[PDB]
Short mmCIF file of C-alpha atoms and ligand atoms in Angstrom, two decimals:
data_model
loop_
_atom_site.label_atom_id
_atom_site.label_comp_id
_atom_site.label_asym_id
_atom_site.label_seq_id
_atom_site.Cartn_x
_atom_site.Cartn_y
_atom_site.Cartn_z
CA UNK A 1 -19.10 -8.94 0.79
CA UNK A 2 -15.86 -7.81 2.58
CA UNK A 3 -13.93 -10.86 0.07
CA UNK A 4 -15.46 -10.08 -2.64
CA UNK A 5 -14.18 -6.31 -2.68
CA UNK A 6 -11.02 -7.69 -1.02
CA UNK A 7 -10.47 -9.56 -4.56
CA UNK A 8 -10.91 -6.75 -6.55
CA UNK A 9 -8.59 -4.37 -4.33
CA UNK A 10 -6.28 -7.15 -4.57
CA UNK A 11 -6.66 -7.34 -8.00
CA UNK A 12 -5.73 -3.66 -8.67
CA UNK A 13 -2.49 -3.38 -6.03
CA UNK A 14 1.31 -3.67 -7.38
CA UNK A 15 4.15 -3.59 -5.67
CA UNK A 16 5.87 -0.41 -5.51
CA UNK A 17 9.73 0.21 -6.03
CA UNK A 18 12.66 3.12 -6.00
CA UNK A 19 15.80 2.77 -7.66
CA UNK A 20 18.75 5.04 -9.26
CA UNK A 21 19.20 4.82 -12.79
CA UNK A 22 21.25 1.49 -13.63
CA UNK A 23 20.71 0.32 -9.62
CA UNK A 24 19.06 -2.03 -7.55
CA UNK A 25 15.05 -1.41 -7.29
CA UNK A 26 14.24 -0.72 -3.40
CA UNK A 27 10.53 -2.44 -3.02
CA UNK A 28 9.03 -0.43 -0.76
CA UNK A 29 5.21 -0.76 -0.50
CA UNK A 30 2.08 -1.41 -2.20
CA UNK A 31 0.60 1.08 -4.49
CA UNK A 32 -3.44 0.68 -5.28
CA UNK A 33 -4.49 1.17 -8.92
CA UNK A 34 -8.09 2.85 -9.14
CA UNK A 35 -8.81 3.88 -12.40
CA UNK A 36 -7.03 3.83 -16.05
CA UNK A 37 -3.42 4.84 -15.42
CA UNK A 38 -3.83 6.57 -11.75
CA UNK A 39 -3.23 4.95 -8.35
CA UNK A 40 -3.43 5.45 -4.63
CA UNK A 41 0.27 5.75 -2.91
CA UNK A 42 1.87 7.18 0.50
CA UNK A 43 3.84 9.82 -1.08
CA UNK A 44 6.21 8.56 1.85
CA UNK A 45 7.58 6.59 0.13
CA UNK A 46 9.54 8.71 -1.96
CA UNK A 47 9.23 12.39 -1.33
CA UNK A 48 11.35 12.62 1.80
CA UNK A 49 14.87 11.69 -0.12
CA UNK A 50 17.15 13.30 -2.03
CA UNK A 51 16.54 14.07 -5.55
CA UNK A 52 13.56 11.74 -5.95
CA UNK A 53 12.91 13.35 -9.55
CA UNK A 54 16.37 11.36 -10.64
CA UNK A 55 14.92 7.96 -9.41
CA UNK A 56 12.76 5.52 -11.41
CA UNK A 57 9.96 4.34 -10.14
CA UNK A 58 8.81 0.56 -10.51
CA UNK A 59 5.32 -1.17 -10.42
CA UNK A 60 5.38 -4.64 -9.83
CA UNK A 61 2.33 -6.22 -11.01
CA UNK A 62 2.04 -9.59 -10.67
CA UNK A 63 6.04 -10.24 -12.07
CA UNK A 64 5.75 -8.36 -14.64
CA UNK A 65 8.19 -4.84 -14.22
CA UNK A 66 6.92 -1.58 -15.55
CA UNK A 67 9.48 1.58 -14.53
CA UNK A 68 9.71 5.02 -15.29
CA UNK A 69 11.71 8.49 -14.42
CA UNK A 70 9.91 9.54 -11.25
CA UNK A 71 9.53 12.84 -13.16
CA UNK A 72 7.36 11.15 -15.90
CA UNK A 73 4.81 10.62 -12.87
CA UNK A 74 2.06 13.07 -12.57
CA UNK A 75 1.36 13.68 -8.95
CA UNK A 76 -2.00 15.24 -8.05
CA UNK A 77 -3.07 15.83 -4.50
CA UNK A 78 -6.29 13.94 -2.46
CA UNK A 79 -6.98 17.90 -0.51
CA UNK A 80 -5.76 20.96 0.83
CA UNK A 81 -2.38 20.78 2.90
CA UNK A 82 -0.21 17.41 3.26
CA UNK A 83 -2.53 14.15 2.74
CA UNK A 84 0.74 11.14 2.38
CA UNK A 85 -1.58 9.37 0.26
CA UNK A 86 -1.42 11.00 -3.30
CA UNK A 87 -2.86 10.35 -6.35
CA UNK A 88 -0.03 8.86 -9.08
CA UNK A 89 -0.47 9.07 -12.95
CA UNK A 90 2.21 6.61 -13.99
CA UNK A 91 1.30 6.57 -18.04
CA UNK A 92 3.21 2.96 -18.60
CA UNK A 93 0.93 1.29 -16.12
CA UNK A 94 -1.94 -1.03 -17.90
CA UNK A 95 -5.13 0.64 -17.42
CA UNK A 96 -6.39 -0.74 -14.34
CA UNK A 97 -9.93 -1.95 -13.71
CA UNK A 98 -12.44 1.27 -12.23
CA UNK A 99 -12.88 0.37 -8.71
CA UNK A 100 -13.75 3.84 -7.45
CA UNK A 101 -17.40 3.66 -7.26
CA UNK A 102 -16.24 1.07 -4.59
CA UNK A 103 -14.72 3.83 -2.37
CA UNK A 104 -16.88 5.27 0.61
CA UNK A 105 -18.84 8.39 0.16
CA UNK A 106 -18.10 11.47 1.89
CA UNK A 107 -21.60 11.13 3.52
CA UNK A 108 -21.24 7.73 4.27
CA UNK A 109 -18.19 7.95 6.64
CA UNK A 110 -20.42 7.59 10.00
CA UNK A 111 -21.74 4.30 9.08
CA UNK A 112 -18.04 2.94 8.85
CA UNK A 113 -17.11 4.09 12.58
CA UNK A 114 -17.11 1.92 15.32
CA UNK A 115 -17.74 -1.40 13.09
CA UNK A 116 -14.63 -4.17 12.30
CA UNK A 117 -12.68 -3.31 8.83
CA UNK A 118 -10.34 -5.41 6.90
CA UNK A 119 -6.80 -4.00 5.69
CA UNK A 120 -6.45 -5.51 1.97
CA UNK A 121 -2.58 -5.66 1.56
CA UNK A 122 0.61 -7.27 0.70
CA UNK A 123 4.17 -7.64 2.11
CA UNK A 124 5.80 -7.28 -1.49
CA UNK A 125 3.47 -8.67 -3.19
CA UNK A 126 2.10 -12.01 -0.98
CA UNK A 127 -1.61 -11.52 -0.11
CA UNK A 128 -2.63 -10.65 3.06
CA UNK A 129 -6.57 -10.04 4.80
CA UNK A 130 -5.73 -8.29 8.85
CA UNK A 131 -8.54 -7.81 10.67
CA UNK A 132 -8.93 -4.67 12.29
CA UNK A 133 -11.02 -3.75 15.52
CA UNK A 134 -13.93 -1.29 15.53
CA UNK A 135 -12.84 1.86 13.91
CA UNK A 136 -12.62 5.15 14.50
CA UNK A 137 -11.30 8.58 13.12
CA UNK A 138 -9.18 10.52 14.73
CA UNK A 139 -9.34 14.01 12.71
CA UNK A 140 -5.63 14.74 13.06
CA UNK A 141 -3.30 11.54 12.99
CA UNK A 142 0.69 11.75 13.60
CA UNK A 143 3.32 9.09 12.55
CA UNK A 144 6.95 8.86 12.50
CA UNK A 145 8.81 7.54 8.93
CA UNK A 146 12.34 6.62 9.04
CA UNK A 147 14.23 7.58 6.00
CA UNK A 148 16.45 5.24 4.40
CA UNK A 149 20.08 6.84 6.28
CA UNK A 150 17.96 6.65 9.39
CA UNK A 151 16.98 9.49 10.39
CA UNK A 152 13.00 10.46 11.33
CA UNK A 153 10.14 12.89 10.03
CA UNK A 154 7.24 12.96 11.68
CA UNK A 155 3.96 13.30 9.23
CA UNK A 156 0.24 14.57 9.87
CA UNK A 157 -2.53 13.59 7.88
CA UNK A 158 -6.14 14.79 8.76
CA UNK A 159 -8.49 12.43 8.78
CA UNK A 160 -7.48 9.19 9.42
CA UNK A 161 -8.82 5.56 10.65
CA UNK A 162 -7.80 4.31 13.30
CA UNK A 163 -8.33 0.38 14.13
CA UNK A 164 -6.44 -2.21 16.67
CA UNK A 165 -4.28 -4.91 14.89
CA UNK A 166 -0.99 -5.90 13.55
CA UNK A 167 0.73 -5.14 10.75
CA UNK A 168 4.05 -5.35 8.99
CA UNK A 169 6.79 -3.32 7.51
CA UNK A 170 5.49 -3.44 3.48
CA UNK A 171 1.85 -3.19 4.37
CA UNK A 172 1.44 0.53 3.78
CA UNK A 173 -0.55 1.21 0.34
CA UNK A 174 -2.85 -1.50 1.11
CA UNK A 175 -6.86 -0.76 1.59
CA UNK A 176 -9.27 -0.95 4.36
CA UNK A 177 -12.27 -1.97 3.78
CA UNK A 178 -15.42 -2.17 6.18
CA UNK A 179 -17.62 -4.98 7.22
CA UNK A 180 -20.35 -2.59 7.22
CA UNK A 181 -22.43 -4.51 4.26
CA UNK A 182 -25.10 -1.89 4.31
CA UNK A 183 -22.50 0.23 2.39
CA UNK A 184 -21.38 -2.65 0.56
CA UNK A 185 -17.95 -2.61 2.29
CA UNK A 186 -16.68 -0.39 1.05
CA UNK A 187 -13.28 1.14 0.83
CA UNK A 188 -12.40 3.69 3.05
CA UNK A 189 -8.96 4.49 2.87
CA UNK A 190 -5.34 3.79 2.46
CA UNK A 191 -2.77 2.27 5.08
CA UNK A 192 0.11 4.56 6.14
CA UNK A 193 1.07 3.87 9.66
CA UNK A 194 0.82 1.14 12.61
CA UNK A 195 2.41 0.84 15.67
CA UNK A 196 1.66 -0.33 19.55
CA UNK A 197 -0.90 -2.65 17.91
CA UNK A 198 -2.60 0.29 16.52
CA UNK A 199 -3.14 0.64 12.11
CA UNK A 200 -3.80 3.88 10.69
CA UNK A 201 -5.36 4.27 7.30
CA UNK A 202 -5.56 7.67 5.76
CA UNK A 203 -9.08 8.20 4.86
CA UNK A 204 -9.83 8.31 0.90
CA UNK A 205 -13.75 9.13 -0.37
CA UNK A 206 -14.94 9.06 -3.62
CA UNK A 207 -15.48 12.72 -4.10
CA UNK A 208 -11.62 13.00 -3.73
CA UNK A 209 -11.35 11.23 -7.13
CA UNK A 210 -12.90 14.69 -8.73
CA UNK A 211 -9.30 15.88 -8.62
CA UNK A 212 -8.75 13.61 -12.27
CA UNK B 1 2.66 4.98 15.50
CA UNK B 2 5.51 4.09 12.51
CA UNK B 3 4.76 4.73 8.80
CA UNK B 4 4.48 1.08 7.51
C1 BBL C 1 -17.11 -3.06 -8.41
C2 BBL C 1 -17.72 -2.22 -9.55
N1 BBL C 1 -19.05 -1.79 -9.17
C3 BBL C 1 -19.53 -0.60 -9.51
O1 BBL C 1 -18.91 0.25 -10.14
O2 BBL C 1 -20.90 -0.35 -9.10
C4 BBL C 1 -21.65 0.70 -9.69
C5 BBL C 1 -23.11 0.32 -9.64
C6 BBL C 1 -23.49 -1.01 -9.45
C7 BBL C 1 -24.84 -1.35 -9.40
C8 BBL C 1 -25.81 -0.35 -9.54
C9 BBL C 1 -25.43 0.98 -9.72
C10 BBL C 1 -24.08 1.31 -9.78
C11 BBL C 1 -17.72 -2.92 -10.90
O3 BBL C 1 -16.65 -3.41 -11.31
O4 BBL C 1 -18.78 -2.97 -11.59
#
């Protein structure tokens, strides 16, 4: 059932956090653990500041702290060309529990289109199921992330989800998952962006787990 | 659409 992967998903996100060296950690968004030390997270959230090597990176999970030098990280793309979501080896994470036979096939994606989803998430780190109307993909998706001093990039991702509902600052990281039980809801992606009662998850299949 |  849509809870029952909702559990594990929620099972296997932490809260993810920026800070200098000797600083205050910046909580940011959620990052998704999918298998032994490697998780799921908007690349967003760090990439576009300066020196983002120097920083530590924190994982929240569950109140207890695990940090790191951002260039202890291994980074490893989902595909060709700019994706936001990346994949994220962070080696002082505890293994997490597999969940990505859970992820949608490749194949599969038709049978999650115009059917309701559910977006998995947190705002740092409080639980949170938002419904999201029938689905579709828009093949090129383009959203606008304000950097910390204020100023604006705007990102494209191919493939993305697209679904109406309402979402908060916080909620990016989290999964969708669809109500389709005939693939036994499965995950299909990663929230990055929302606005004008619009959410947009960048779509994540199994095979993209092939890159380690 | 805003990155969230
Ligand atoms: C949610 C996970 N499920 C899983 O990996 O399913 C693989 C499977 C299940 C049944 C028959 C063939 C393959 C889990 O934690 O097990």
């Amino acid at each position: 059932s849509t809870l029952e992967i909702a559990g594990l998903v929620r099972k296997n996100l932490v809260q993810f956090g920026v800070g200098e060296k000797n600083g205050s950690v910046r909580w940011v968004m959620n990052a998704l653990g999918v298998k032994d030390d490697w998780l799921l997270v908007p690349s967003h959230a760090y990439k576009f500041e300066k020196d983002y090597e120097m920083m530590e990176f924190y994982f929240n999970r569950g109140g207890t702290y695990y940090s790191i030098s951002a260039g202890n990280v291994v980074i490893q793309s989902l595909d060709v060309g700019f994706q936001d979501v990346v994949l994220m080896k962070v080696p002082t994470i505890p293994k997490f529990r597999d969940i990505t036979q859970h992820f949608i096939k490749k194949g599969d994606v038709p049978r999650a289109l115009n059917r309701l989803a559910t977006l998995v998430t947190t705002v740092n780190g409080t639980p949170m199921l938002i419904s999201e109307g029938p689905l579709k993909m828009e093949e090129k998706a383009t959203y606008v992330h304000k950097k910390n001093d204020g100023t604006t990039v705007d990102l494209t991702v191919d493939q993305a989800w697209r679904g109406k509902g309402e979402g908060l600052p916080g909620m990016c990281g989290g999964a969708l998952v669809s109500s389709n039980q005939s693939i036994q809801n499965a995950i299909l992606g990663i929230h990055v962006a929302g606005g004008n009662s619009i959410l947009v998850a960048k779509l994540v299949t199994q095979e993209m787990f092939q890159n380690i | 659409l805003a990155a969230q």
